[PDB]
Symmetry: C4
């Protein structure tokens, strides 16, 4: 009865994780397009920048495909949980199914953060190299140093925002992963009662971490979106 | 009995590791709170920083939840060790439990160091963008460069302190992780006698590393706390 | 027939996607190792009497040998993967052995690819760091600070552009590797008919999107060749 | 018959290659920990009243202890690996049990090695960052900015060359580790006679390329010792 109770609370918590993960992925990929536009306008004749754009588009395709799989695996996990509660299938198959949906989602999420991180850092590096060339050329060094300082200030604020999103979900992914690891060690009734108290508290805090992560995702949207418009201008 | 002898010292070593890991997590998360305060004060109208603050609190929740699991798994590990010493259960079940408790804690510990590192780097990056804006604005560039230089000195030494704590326990985690793998390969009596000498010396060096890590934990609180006050000041 | 046919259909398209991935991975490694050769020459010319620079050259050549050796393995495993997939379609072998074989060929190659991008990045970052230390030493010595800062700014612009190009190549295949790894993970969880009907739609779309990612990566690889090769010539001059 | 001879032949050459890796990795670890001692002293001399620096020193001493423990385990497992290989040749034990032992000894050794490279790299980066904070504070204070800016450039030049040297060591063995890891993965997939015949060609070539990487790595280890040691004494003076 305790095992069936834990599997339900874990399954519900994992469902909440995929929702937040999907919201993040949709918004991060939206920011990436606008970021890629700013980068092209900043350096339109660079084959290196063009390679990054093609590479970023390819990575974006893989992220979308990977989450579609994660949603389907969650559905297979739902059935396996019911059957594990009904005693038809070994509960370990349900844990591996829940683990699969969890790991696939976070994997796609972490790649989205990395592509956006590298893109914002690319804009910063390209801008630093463009203005510095004008400063040393005497093309109004006073105005160039100001735009350089402003641009770096805008990219830094966006990089800090994206890093907050990763740390938000990484904490939730860490808690849920520890819960699944406890269930794999607690195979008998004796073990399950030892971890039951810790696991129940972990599932609640994991959902709290998702809440703070969802809040962080919203602020990251406003932060990066506004900063990308000032850069475009 | 020789296998039971190693399993006893190994269980003790993992218990000491979990003790140091908890103190580290307790102190690192405490420094994070003050670090988040300094970051907000540096740029109070930045939504990017706000996203990180929410994200950092969310990550902190996951670290506490993940460590609660590590405590429970250690208790389950203790019973499986007793049964392995008494011959009721295969020692492999005890090793799988010890590895889980060990890996879960270090995962939460390594994440705590990462969140704090990112926060200190944010304080450094935000200050660099604030002072540079004042230097270029003519608001006493001599004095601003002095505050800028001091701030970078304060953030840099704090990053060195956190890095010492992470490397301390990572060394201990490496030794214990190698011991568990050796016991899993040496299943027969012949194999166990070959690794016994290497394992016993490893247990001593691993505990010495945990002690050296605790010392680093002590210095890190005093160092970072003082440095964070000067930045706030 | 109603369900063993859907399994055979997915395993074939998956094998095709892995085949395209393995081809792109080989092309990437071939050119990245070529750019590394040109980069090591520029690095030696930048600091020819440094034992630190020489140590990296020795280390970089050793890593290149491991990348070439690792990819020869990845192609052979693909052949073993082909046999196990066909036998799984014919019901001769459990489908997990075919999935586990595909993972080996996939993971081993991408590992060699990941190292090629990393070694090239470290070399390009070394060229930038060595040049920064050479020009700054000349600027502080009064050896025409205006011209040195111009070369310093140009050099940093050229090294940065090459690092951005390499980063685009890695992210291109990483997206494809992400999709295919998720596809295999779904097939390993969906062993029965009921689960397989749920993931079939997502898997079919994923294999197409994965093939698009491989194409977008190949384009990035070609653009990276022209950019980095040309930039390395300007640095040598 | 002939397939068991091919398997026994590959397992022997693999064991030889893995044995060379652990020895070369051990020599590197011995030298890296020796350079780490000198590096911790240079950092201490640069900032003797910083508890942050002291915390890193204590942490580095602990990490150094863990690396030695991990390497002692890796040699013992290598001995167990040799016996399991002999038993697999005689057909007494499943070859998969021997592969997990070889992989274990391989993974345990490289883990300690990669940590050693990180600790030294982090220590060298700390010396560079601490020096930047010492000279810049003096430059802004008017304490002879001409001499301070030169010392700042000289220190960064010495730290950068050492970081390039250490990076050559990491890439050297990681390339060898990549080849050996790919070989072990191929043997676990090629269980039947047909599969073993496919990987024989790739594995035999890989073992030669893997040993070539070890040779180029050993050269890098020798050059890295002289480079980093020489740079560390100039800073001490």
């Amino acid at each position: 009865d305790l095992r069936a109770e834990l599997l339900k609370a874990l399954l519900k918590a994992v469902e909440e994780f995929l929702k937040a993960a999907e919201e993040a992925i949709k918004e991060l990929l939206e920011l990436l397009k606008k970021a890629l536009e700013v980068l092209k306008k900043l350096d339109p004749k660079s084959k290196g920048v063009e390679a990054l754009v093609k590479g970023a588009k390819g990575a974006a395709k893989g992220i979308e495909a990977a989450m579609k799989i994660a949603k389907a695996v969650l559905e297979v996990a739902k059935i396996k949980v019911e059957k594990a509660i009904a005693g038809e299938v070994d509960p370990e198959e349900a844990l591996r199914a829940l683990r699969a949906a969890l790991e696939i989602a976070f994997a796609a999420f972490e790649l989205a953060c990395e592509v956006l991180k590298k893109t914002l850092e690319a804009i910063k590096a390209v801008a630093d190299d463009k203005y510095t060339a004008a400063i040393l050329a005497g093309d109004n060094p006073a105005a160039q140093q100001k735009a350089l300082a402003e641009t770096n200030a805008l990219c830094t604020d966006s990089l800090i925002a994206v890093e907050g999103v990763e740390k938000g979900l990484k904490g939730a992914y860490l808690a849920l992963e520890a819960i699944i690891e406890a269930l794999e060690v607690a195979e008998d009734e004796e073990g399950l009662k030892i971890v039951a108290k810790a696991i129940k508290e972990a599932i609640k805090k994991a959902e709290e971490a998702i809440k703070k992560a969802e809040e962080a995702i919203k602020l990251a949207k406003e932060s990066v979106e506004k900063n990308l418009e000032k850069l475009k201008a």
